Design a protein around this nucleic acid. Structure first.
Ligand SMILES: [Zn+2]
Ligand SMILES: [Zn+2]
Ligand SMILES: [Zn+2]
Ligand SMILES: [Zn+2]
Ligand SMILES: [Zn+2]
Ligand SMILES: [Zn+2]
Lengths: 836, 836
DNA sequence: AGTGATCAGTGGTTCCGGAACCACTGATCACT
DNA sequence: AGTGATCAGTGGTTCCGGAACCACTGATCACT
């Protein structure tokens, strides 16, 4: 059986009609913009999700004709849990299995002395008696109250047992036995208690190991790990400005120490002798939104003073397995956790219960390794995971949940993944497939393309040049006759990415020293300037930590004298050799309808002035503003410049319809009359970057921003192509162009976080190109990449590792691609060998 | 492959572990209470839904260990669309295909004169010219302005065409041609216009046939069909009581016609001369929640004065196909609509476009027939469909949507279905299966059980007697060795339901005459009294209409002098032969935690008094109230009687935990000390109906209500079994017992709407039994049923039909089962033959 | 000349709680 | 004796809108 799309014309799709094989690893490929995400995500996923949800208890319809074989679909991608209560543990369901394990095996200790607790059955004490006492001894059985009094004979077994038990009933689980002869006394408990102090540990159940249960969570943090401590970002007195009388009362006591109308001893205003600003705003928090107000403004979430950030109460933290309480265990990297579960030797009475439990835990602990997250710890906040880390956890969870019958759609799951781990991701993708799921992956990575069960190539190119199936079938087929597609060619060899054959050398260098932020091993980084630098290393090695959470803020402050948070470090040297810093991370473009490529990269400004220079617009009052659809005056006022009004009808969601006044041109007739070389302002939003780049050859300032958009490959996009309809690789690329178009000083530092995300072989080519051009002008470019085609072109490389997590944070290697490719201390080098 | 439940212990499930075959028609069967709904719905569906939804963009966990092979699951059952905009058409997606059809073919007429509109191409008029005019004529081509002036020669074809076109450009689609020789003039339009009046019909598109589009809906009702007309349920002046000054102004003008402080001429207060109460409260509606206030209270939704309730604007209503505008078409029963589409003979140029469209519409129009809803019309409000009608529409839609890979779980889909249509439902169930879905049906119907690909029988009996797989495998297997289950036996023949062999005769009769409510053909029903009556007939025949929406309210008013709405009719006769009327419809029990069987059927009252009679409770102040957990005094005040407190934690949903004070017994220690025959009040909520029925043999009033619960089969339920945890066949049965326990007059009328819903062969037996016992005491019992085992036992039958919809509403037949089984004018009789 | 650092105005996101309404319990009144 | 027709108190359902917050456009100022 197979999935059968027919009449697919979403976005730029050209009414295509493709048969996708069910239960296979299908990779959909294509140059960024081609619209293969519009087929994977906005058609297939979007309909399989729809058809399902609308069959439930309902509280858009993707433009397709029909789709046979469609199944409930799930999209996996970069989507953070947001709430403070999610750990890697909880999110993968693994923590729960753990909560049961610690419940079943694992001994409680004393919540204060740490001494292992003790309890005995009536079996165990009846047996104690016959060891400590001589058969024939006359004994008393008490209840802390005479219960029985007899002779310790084997013949009296049940009498003893009956009385032993009764003694615990009345004794509240406590029974005393006296050796009437010797005077020796023995007190016992059918329940857990400390020998050194006599306190009764709680009821051992999974609920106790749950920092999301009243039974498990810490008393003064509710299992969150942190509390809400007011922060001296409260200083006129910033949090008092909703009642002037407040500000005055303290001013009157200030004038009582002899001051008007900041002078030393500010410590009083802040604490008191009476009531300080701090404890007062802290009291307002307890004694009460306006609870929300003070959370956003004056409050910093600090670690829980009591549990230490361990979330669990004092008791739960006292149950141990081979020395580790459940939290301690979740702190081991998921691979240490694994071995711990293995070098675990439990009595066979124990290994009889745990048994399968223990296997169930290890099976999905592995799915985490198999996806390359073996460096994480379950204790890890879901909150603080990269997008790629999130993406691969959903993959492991979903393959763990063993759900079957669905169509999974993944967008570029190699994001954040070293070339070294690609092998294992493909192996997990195929496993998620062998549960009997259709796995559809939008990817650009060759290794993944080569492992596809079926490929579908969309193009030829972006925008109107896409929406067509330029190839479909097997890998062998595509490599047997590749003349058919740009993807086929980059695999065949026809097109390739050139290793610039001459390395560059610096003119100065940057030296950030003693970098201790996160897992970075108190390192000393020297960054060559005026060269193309790369930062590589396996996931978890510390790339983002160093480059983006330390190096970046730090320069921003030594350059803009600003107060940005940054990673721990000792010093920076030679920062005067750069005089501006531009950064482009992976975050998403702000999407409004009031925005298109032209307005976003600002070229439209220059174009608005050109139109306001036309004799006709000079003849009238017209200036540049007349030509903005976001400004009253020359836009269409029916639809406020939108090109559509909003029709309000009863009992239905609002529906937007074309503006009948302006026809959706979104300008008033008068403005549409001003023309340059024959076209009005609306006509100019209809042309592609390539079209506009021609039209404007002679207008230098315009042609420039345009050229950039063309150079990054975006040359095929409509200027007015609204921001919302923008694809991911475009939007990133526009955000890219928006920065790359501001003239450079010749000594600016460009920081790029995985710039090749959402980029095809082809787009990457134009990219490394543009980047080379940037350094020639004496500019420094740092990129964090796992993409080998971008790494071959660096003149310097700083390789972090050797592994991820706590087993990384080391500069394992540095030098040119070549110096790195000979270094056997580096994985990056081990793969950089087969491209040099 | 197969689904594999392991460690299933939801509700009364006994930790069972069943393998269900994937892609099969699986019927799960069992005596009502057995907990087979807890496995179908609360385990399988509940998890397949969960695992899916939690994989999406999340904004309980059914107690099971593991479930392999699980797929996204969908439950189909009695669940109304609630909104005023849903029709059968829209809900099945069929209307949309229709909107396209009327767009593609189907001629517009004049929105007022009804004269078919006309337009011509430049091709059509160029050709007209050469017919009307003699080749050689000199002509002028105008624009309503001389465009051209030439000679009508074939040699001038393009000149004419070019000018013809230009003439329409400037002419606004209008071109005039003069025969300069003859004086004859011809005006043409490239667009639709009326020859008799010259108005331009709108842009013909699907959006125009959409009463949910600004383009399609009616102007003064927005495609809803009705408006909001204030109703004289406004009379001190009920809608003026939020401003006394109002009531006074009118009182001062009343005292100006000479009245204080109702006297004839009330018409003024209501309308004015100045402003009446009605137009004013009507003005408050337009000129403005408090819009909501007046909707609930003083306003009645009346039909739209303009569109007539047709929803569509005047234009859309003017496009016709073979004489019918799109609404007219949706009024035909889905089977007339079908034939209409067939006896439709469209020109081959037409049948080339519509072609597949027309087939796509007919395919799913059939799924409606195949499920037995051929009697409906697309125009039918989704709002006013029975639960069973809803259920089978989702089935047709879902089989229409061709979705595949999911597990469908249906609860008793024969609800509302005549025995005659069961054949076709099974055929649809198997079709929904052959798309490659697992179809799991909780059913009791033998015909469906016999068509199962795989059966799973749960029991032995209800409550603690269930939760076990008492058989699984094929139909043949079960009938080859049936000694294994109560279901197996009712098929084998071992157990059977006896046709009471002696019919009863009335002592009087009820005669409701001229019943015209809904589709009932102005009929005259005579109801025999003191006998067991049944009302039968195919879905849509009018059973609910007659018995429940006319007969019922009508008696309620002639008995309670109340003002209930009722179906249209002329008169009632002999209503004095009954002096009380009890009714039990299919609606659901109000579910609170403050309720159990014992409190619901009120027996717990009698039990509370017994406990307040105990010497110990007499010795103290205690009365009956002390023994209610819903009253302050003797319940547990920690948990307000709930048996659990609510723990509020941060950032997580509330979690309820056992009350540590009362241990979940929900009474304070003092009360728990009063005992009767050795058990406190809590202990008595723990015992089953059968247990309690023993315990209380000698307490007559108690034993009675209990006996009822035992007689309907409910003898196995915990008295304190909370209302929420109640199954459907139980809850209905409790609601049943709650009425059947009030002593009868000996002349009360009992009306039961499908009382055998959610009932097993076995429960039906105990039911017809109880019902017989009720008539012996001279009581009249009317039941609406399709269940043949209940119908064999009637002494009279009133068969409605012969079909559903407008082709029903006739009393096709009456008499005893036998008199009916010989009547070939009746389907009921045609199946009642094989059980007599 | 081109910038960045601003500000107003505007759109997208997201992240929650109440009011009204209806059903059940368990009491009394007004009775058969 | 047991009812139904009441009423208060309480729980379940359901059916919605704003405020705050953040991003983008496109202007001016203060400059290189
Ligand atoms: Zn201790
Ligand atoms: Zn804490
Ligand atoms: Zn407009
Ligand atoms: Zn007309
Ligand atoms: Zn209307
Ligand atoms: Zn309690």
């Amino acid at each position: 059986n197979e999935i059968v799309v027919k009449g697919a014309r979403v976005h730029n799709l050209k009414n295509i009609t493709v048969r996708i094989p069910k239960n296979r690893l299908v990779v959909i490929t294509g140059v960024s913009g081609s619209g293969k995400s519009s087929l994977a995500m906005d058609t297939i996923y979007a309909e399989g999700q729809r058809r399902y949800l609308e069959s439930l208890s309902t509280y858009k319809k993707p433009d397709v004709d029909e789709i046979e074989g469609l199944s409930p679909a799930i999209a996996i991608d970069q989507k953070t849990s947001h709430n403070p209560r999610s750990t890697v543990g909880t999110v993968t369901e693994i923590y729960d299995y753990l909560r049961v394990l610690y419940a079943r095996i694992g001994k409680a200790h004393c919540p204060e002395c740490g001494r292992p607790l003790e309890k005995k059955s009536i079996d165990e004490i009846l047996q104690d008696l016959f060891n400590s006492f001589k058969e024939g001894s006359r004994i008393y059985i008490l209840a802390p109250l005479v219960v029985d009094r007899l002779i310790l004979e084997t013949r009296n077994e049940h009498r003893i047992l009956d009385s032993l038990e009764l003694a615990m009933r009345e004794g509240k689980g406590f029974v005393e036995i006296r050796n009437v002869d010797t005077g020796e006394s023995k007190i016992f408990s059918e329940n857990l208690m400390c020998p050194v102090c006599g306190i009764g540990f709680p009821e051992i159940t999974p609920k106790l190991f749950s920092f999301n249960s009243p039974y498990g969570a810490c008393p003064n943090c509710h299992g969150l790990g942190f509390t809400f401590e007011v922060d001296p970002s409260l200083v006129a007195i910033i949090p008092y400005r909703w009642d002037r009388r407040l500000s005055r009362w303290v001013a009157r006591e200030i004038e009582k120490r002899g001051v008007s109308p900041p002078e030393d001893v500010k410590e009083f205003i802040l604490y008191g002798d009476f009531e300080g600003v701090v404890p007062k705003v802290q009291r307002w928090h307890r004694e009460t939104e306006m609870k929300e107000w003070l959370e956003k403004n004056f409050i910093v979430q600090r670690t829980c003073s009591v549990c230490g950030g361990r979330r669990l109460n004092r008791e739960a933290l006292s149950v141990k397995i081979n020395g580790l309480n459940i939290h301690e265990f979740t702190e081991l990297s998921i691979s240490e956790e694994l071995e711990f579960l293995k070098n675990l030797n439990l009595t066979e009475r124990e290994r009889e219960i745990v048994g399968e439990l223990l296997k169930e835990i290890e099976k999905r602990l592995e799915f985490l390794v198999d996806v390359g997250l073996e460096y994480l710890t379950l204790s890890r906040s879901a909150t603080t995971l990269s997008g790629g880390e999130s993406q691969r956890i959903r993959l492991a969870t979903q393959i763990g949940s063993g759900l079957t019958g669905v169509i999974y759609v993944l967008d570029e799951p190699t994001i954040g993944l070293h070339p070294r781990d690609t092998e294992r991701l493909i192996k997990t993708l195929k496993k998620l497939r062998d549960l009997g799921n259709t796995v559809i992956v939008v990817e650009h990575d060759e290794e993944v393309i080569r492992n596809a069960d079926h490929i579908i190539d969309i193009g030829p190119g972006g925008g109107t040049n896409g929406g067509r199936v330029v190839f479909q079938g097997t890998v062998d087929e595509l490599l047997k006759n590749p003349d058919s597609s740009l993807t086929g060619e980059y695999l065949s060899g026809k097109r390739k990415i050139t290793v610039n054959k001459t390395r560059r050398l610096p003119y100065a260098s940057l030296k950030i020293k003693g970098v201790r932020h996160n897992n970075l091993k108190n390192i000393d980084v020297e960054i060559p300037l005026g060269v193309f630098v790369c930062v590589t290393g396996v996931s978890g090695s510390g790339k983002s930590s160093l480059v983006m959470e330390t190096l970046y803020p730090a320069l921003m402050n030594l350059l803009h004298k600003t107060k940005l948070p940054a990673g721990e470090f000792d010093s920076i040297e030679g920062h005067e050799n750069i005089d501006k810093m531009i950064a482009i991370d992976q975050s998403p473009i702000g999407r409004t309808p009031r925005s298109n490529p032209a307005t976003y990269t600002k070229v439209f400004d220059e174009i608005r002035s050109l139109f306001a220079m036309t004799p006709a617009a000079k003849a009238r009052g017209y200036n540049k503003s007349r030509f903005s659809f976001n400004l009253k005056g020359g836009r269409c006022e029916a639809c406020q410049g939108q090109g559509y009004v909003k029709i309000e009808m009863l009992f239905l969601p609002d529906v937007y319809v074309e503006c009948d006044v302006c026809k959706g041109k979104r300008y008033n007739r008068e403005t549409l009359e001003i023309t340059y070389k024959g076209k009005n302002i609306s006509d100019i939003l209809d042309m592609t970057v390539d079209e506009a780049l021609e039209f404007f050859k002679n207008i230098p300032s315009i042609k420039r921003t345009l050229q950039v958009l063309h150079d990054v490959g975006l040359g095929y996009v409509k200027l007015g192509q609204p921001a919302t309809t923008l694809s991911g690789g475009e939007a990133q690329r526009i955000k890219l162009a928006s920065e790359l178009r501001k003239r450079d000083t010749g000594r600016t530092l460009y920081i790029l976080d995985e710039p090749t995300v959402g980029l095809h072989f082809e787009d990457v080519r134009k990219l490394v190109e543009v980047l080379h051009r940037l350094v020639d002008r004496g500019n420094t470019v740092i990129v964090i990449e796992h993409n080998l085609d971008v790494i071959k072109n660096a003149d310097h490389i700083i390789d972090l590792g050797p592994e991820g997590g706590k087993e990384g944070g080391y500069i394992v290697a540095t030098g040119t691609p070549e110096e790195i490719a000979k270094n056997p201390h580096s994985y990056t080098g081990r793969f950089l060998k087969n491209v040099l």
